[PDB]
């Protein structure tokens, strides 16, 4: 936590959130928990919400030592919607297109996050 | 078929398929329909049931003409994992996998799959 190896992978980490991730288009209903005044049953139907805002805690108190652990995260945000919203709704497609800008900015930066993950375990 | 834009951009597809999605780790429960001999209630739980298999046998047969359909039966083996295994399960991180590589190829692909689409689309 105090080392900069592991400092520097949650920062990458949060960049992807606040800058990729949460510039989705109408991606806002996904960018904190999801609040029961205006989805009154979401926590009866859901057993383990996710989304963005508790992610960057996360990354804040230095949960995800690999990118593995995160991407489960932000991959349960969709399949919660798949759940909740149904597979063919306007926010599962956002919900995928949060997922997708994700996927592919981890797998951009692969190289640079594996050896962050190594010097992680190392230390 | 004789259209050879159909047929190109029916062998792109089949290499996601093959090369990208059915190469996710652990991924075999997906490449053919579920046997109901050792998943005995998955075809009285699951109306529209889903797979790698079946999505190739639709490309060997032109099915697709746009990248819309495609993903509407990959995204349905999603929805189908989620209903029936659960938003958390390894089975549905496993099919977000498969799910999360198409979309990523997709775009890989962007400008021959345009093209194609529209060269299909003329005629």
Redesign the interface.
Known sequence: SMDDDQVAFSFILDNIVTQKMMAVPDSWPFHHPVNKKFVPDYYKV???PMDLETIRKNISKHKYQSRESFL?DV??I???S??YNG?ESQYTKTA?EI??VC??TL?EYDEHLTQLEKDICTA
Chains 1, 2 share one sequence.
């Open positions: 859901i057993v383990n489960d991959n349960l969709l399949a919660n798949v759940k597979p995928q997922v997708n996927y592919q797998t």
